[PDB]
Write a protein that binds this ligand. Sequence first.
Ligand SMILES: Cc1ccc(SCCNc2ccc(S(=O)(=O)NC(=O)c3ccc(-c4ccc(F)cc4)cc3)cc2[N+](=O)[O-])c(C)c1
Length: 200
Amino acid sequence: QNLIKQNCELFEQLGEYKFQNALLVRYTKKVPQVSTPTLVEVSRNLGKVGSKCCKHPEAKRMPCAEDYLSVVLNQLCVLHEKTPVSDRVTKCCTESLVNRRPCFSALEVDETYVPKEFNAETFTFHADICTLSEKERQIKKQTALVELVKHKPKATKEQLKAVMDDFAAFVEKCCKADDKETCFAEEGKKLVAASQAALG
Ligand SMILES: Cc1ccc(SCCNc2ccc(S(=O)(=O)NC(=O)c3ccc(-c4ccc(F)cc4)cc3)cc2[N+](=O)[O-])c(C)c1
């Protein structure tokens, strides 16, 4: 049961957004090839959910979470049905009742990533990213790193932290100039030009 507390204490130690950074890499790797928005659908909720439970003792801690915990799963039942993706997760999408959770929890990492996306032309930044709806930044500023995982899982957290400081600056100028529109493209491409070559 402690497994639940470990996250409860960690959630407060880090936060709501950061906490997702970890769960994300875990959820993403857990079910590869399940679309980005999807993983965020539940992830974004699970993370923010931490706020729903943070005041009552261990006694009312779990119970307070069970509320959404039971709701989410119930939603995935029909939700997943609409999205016929995956296998091990799909085949075990509709059981004979009484063995829905067990079949899920019992299931471990699969990493059965057969397909891939080599579309470099796609994916853009655009200026709207820092003009049309600021709140959007919440989701926008997150998938960028996720893409790197899908393209090549297994990253260096120690090194990632470093870039986190440099990224804070990039975004700053990214939207704080007269001709930011061109910068987003020019500057946005430059970064890709250096990465395309190599990283180390
Ligand atoms: C249609 C579809 C398919 C996949 C996905 S991505 C997420 C895959 N689903 C998933 C993954 C792991 C676990 S798990 O490993 O058994 N549970 C956890 O990892 C877990 C982590 C943290 C907490 C936690 C609880 C309380 C708290 F305060 C903090 C953390 C609880 C459970 C459970 C599910 N699930 O039920 O769908 C999508 C999106 C759609």
